[PDB]
Design an enzyme around this catalytic site. Sequence first.
Site, PDB file in Angstrom:
ATOM      1  N   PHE A   1       0.972  -1.444  -0.188  1.00 54.61           N
ATOM      2  CA  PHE A   1       0.252   0.266   0.398  1.00 54.61           C
ATOM      3  C   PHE A   1       0.633   1.067   0.288  1.00 54.61           C
ATOM      4  O   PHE A   1       1.996   1.830   0.933  1.00 54.61           O
ATOM      5  CB  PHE A   1      -0.722  -0.121   1.037  1.00 54.61           C
ATOM      6  CG  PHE A   1      -2.114   1.109   0.902  1.00 54.61           C
ATOM      7  CD1 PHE A   1      -3.481   0.969   0.011  1.00 54.61           C
ATOM      8  CD2 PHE A   1      -2.142   1.963   1.877  1.00 54.61           C
ATOM      9  CE1 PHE A   1      -4.257   1.795   0.066  1.00 54.61           C
ATOM     10  CE2 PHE A   1      -3.096   3.150   1.950  1.00 54.61           C
ATOM     11  CZ  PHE A   1      -4.467   2.851   1.224  1.00 54.61           C
TER      12      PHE A   1
ATOM     13  N   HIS B   1       0.188   7.856   2.198  1.00 56.17           N
ATOM     14  CA  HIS B   1      -0.829   8.350   2.240  1.00 56.17           C
ATOM     15  C   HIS B   1      -0.535   8.847   3.269  1.00 56.17           C
ATOM     16  O   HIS B   1       0.462   8.090   4.623  1.00 56.17           O
ATOM     17  CB  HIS B   1      -2.083   7.824   2.587  1.00 56.17           C
ATOM     18  CG  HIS B   1      -1.959   6.558   3.851  1.00 56.17           C
ATOM     19  ND1 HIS B   1      -1.430   4.934   3.107  1.00 56.17           N
ATOM     20  CD2 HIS B   1      -1.897   6.487   5.012  1.00 56.17           C
ATOM     21  CE1 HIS B   1      -1.257   4.295   4.750  1.00 56.17           C
ATOM     22  NE2 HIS B   1      -2.165   5.412   5.130  1.00 56.17           N
TER      23      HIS B   1
HETATM   24  C1  MDZ Z   1      -2.313   1.121   7.779  1.00 53.99           C
HETATM   25  C2  MDZ Z   1      -2.985   0.360   8.583  1.00 53.99           C
HETATM   26  C3  MDZ Z   1      -3.940   1.213   9.080  1.00 53.99           C
HETATM   27  C4  MDZ Z   1      -3.721  -0.149   6.574  1.00 53.99           C
HETATM   28  O1  MDZ Z   1      -4.457   0.727   6.104  1.00 53.99           O
HETATM   29  C5  MDZ Z   1      -5.712   1.424   6.463  1.00 53.99           C
HETATM   30  O2  MDZ Z   1      -6.576   0.513   7.305  1.00 53.99           O
HETATM   31  C6  MDZ Z   1      -5.988   2.072   5.554  1.00 53.99           C
HETATM   32  N1  MDZ Z   1      -7.416   2.396   5.694  1.00 53.99           N
HETATM   33  C7  MDZ Z   1      -8.277   2.804   4.801  1.00 53.99           C
HETATM   34  O3  MDZ Z   1      -8.247   2.410   3.532  1.00 53.99           O
HETATM   35  C8  MDZ Z   1      -9.655   3.644   5.321  1.00 53.99           C
HETATM   36  C9  MDZ Z   1     -10.679   2.484   5.628  1.00 53.99           C
HETATM   37  C10 MDZ Z   1     -12.101   3.460   5.837  1.00 53.99           C
HETATM   38  C11 MDZ Z   1     -12.983   2.647   6.586  1.00 53.99           C
HETATM   39  N2  MDZ Z   1     -13.209   1.573   5.302  1.00 53.99           N
HETATM   40  C12 MDZ Z   1     -14.143   3.214   7.183  1.00 53.99           C
HETATM   41  O4  MDZ Z   1     -15.022   3.767   6.309  1.00 53.99           O
HETATM   42  O5  MDZ Z   1     -13.985   3.868   8.042  1.00 53.99           O
HETATM   43  C13 MDZ Z   1      -5.169   3.304   5.328  1.00 53.99           C
HETATM   44  C14 MDZ Z   1      -5.174   4.594   4.444  1.00 53.99           C
HETATM   45  S1  MDZ Z   1      -5.161   3.758   6.903  1.00 53.99           S
HETATM   46  C15 MDZ Z   1      -3.035  -1.340   6.303  1.00 53.99           C
HETATM   47  O6  MDZ Z   1      -2.514  -1.388   5.151  1.00 53.99           O
HETATM   48  O7  MDZ Z   1      -2.590  -2.293   7.223  1.00 53.99           O
HETATM   49 FE   FE2 Z   2      -2.561   4.331   7.394  1.00 57.28          FE
END
Ligand code: MDZ
Ligand code: FE2
EC number: 1.21.3.1
Length: 329
Positions: A209, A212
Site C-alpha cells: 500500500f 498516504h
Molecule cells: C495502515 C493500516 C492502518 C492499514 O491501512 C488502512 O487501514 C487504510 N485505511 C483505509 O483504507 C480507510 C478505511 C476506512 C474505513 N473503510 C471506514 O469506512 O472508516 C490506510 C489508508 S490508513 C493497512 O493497510 O495495514
Molecule cells: Fe494509514
Amino acid sequence: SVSKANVPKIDVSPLFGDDQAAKMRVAQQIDAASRDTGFFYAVNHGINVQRLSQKTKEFHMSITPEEKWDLAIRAYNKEHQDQVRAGYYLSIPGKKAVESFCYLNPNFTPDHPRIQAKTPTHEVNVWPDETKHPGFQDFAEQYYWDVFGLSSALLKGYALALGKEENFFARHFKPDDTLASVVLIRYPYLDPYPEAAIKTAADGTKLSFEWHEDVSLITVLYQSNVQNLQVETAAGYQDIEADDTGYLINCGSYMAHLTNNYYKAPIHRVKWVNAERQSLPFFVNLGYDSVIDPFDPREPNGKSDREPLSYGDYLQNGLVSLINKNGQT
Ligand SMILES: CC(C)[C@@H](OC(=O)[C@@H](NC(=O)CCC[C@H](N)C(=O)O)[C@@H](C)S)C(=O)O
Ligand SMILES: [Fe+2]
C-alpha cells in the site's frame, strides 16, 4: 539498509486515572513523539490484544466466499448500495491479496436519527450468520467499546499535550454518534504471490500500500508481529518496528488541520511482506457535526489562518480521496 524509526513506548495507564501530574508527564511524551516521527506505541493499555488476534483469525480463516458476497460493500456487490463503509472488502485472487471487514458504531441501528435521515457516512453494520461465527458479533461490538475507551484516554493525553483541558477532543467523541470504525484486515501468505498485488515505490521498495496520510483524528492500530510499516522523515523512509503487545498511535489529517500542522499527520506506507498477518486499525473519528476551531500552539495568541471544517465533511471527502489515490481496498 533502512534505518529504524524512533517510535517510543509510552505507558498510557495514567490517562485512565486521576493523578493529574502523572497525566501531564504522559502528555509530554505524546507531544514529543507527535513532533518527531509522529508515531508511538501505547503500552499498559489494558486491552487483551492476544484475544482480539485470536478471534479475528478465527473469523478470517472460517468465512467462506458465499458469506463474503453476502456481506460485501457496494464496490464488490452492486446489490448493496447502502454499504459504502461497512461490510466485507474482497480479495481478488491473482490480483489483490488484501481483504478486510469494516464495522462502525454499534449504536447506528435502524432507529438512530442519523440512519433515519440517511446522513452520509452513517450505516447499520452487517454481520455474518451467528451460527457460522458463534460469538463473533458480540466479541466485535465489545472490542469497539474497549478500543473506544482507550481512544478516549489517548485523546485526553493529546489535549493536555496541546495545552488544552483534557476533554477538548473527547467531548466530541461520544458513543451515541461517533463515526469511528474498526477494520479487520487480513494480509495473506500466498505462494505464489501475485505481482499485480505488489507495488514498487520510487525508491525501489516493494509495497502492499502506497504512501498516504490517515483520514482520522488519531489512528489506534494493532498489528501482528511482522514488520511492515514505514514512516517518511527528514532522513527518508524509516522502518517502524512491530510490537504485537502495544497499539501503534499516530495523528490523522484532521489533527494536522486543527493544529496548523504542529502535530503533522505522518506520511507512511506498507511494505510488501509474504506473511500471514493482521492489521486491525481503529480510526478515531468524531461526530458528523463536530467542529473544533483550528488553532496554532506555536503562536503566542494561538490563532490560525485555517477555516473550520466539520468532521462529517472532512470524513466523507477524505475516504473518497484515499480510494482515488491508493485504490479501492
Ligand atoms: C495502515 C493500516 C492502518 C492499514 O491501512 C488502512 O487501514 C487504510 N485505511 C483505509 O483504507 C480507510 C478505511 C476506512 C474505513 N473503510 C471506514 O469506512 O472508516 C490506510 C489508508 S490508513 C493497512 O493497510 O495495514
Ligand atoms: Fe494509514
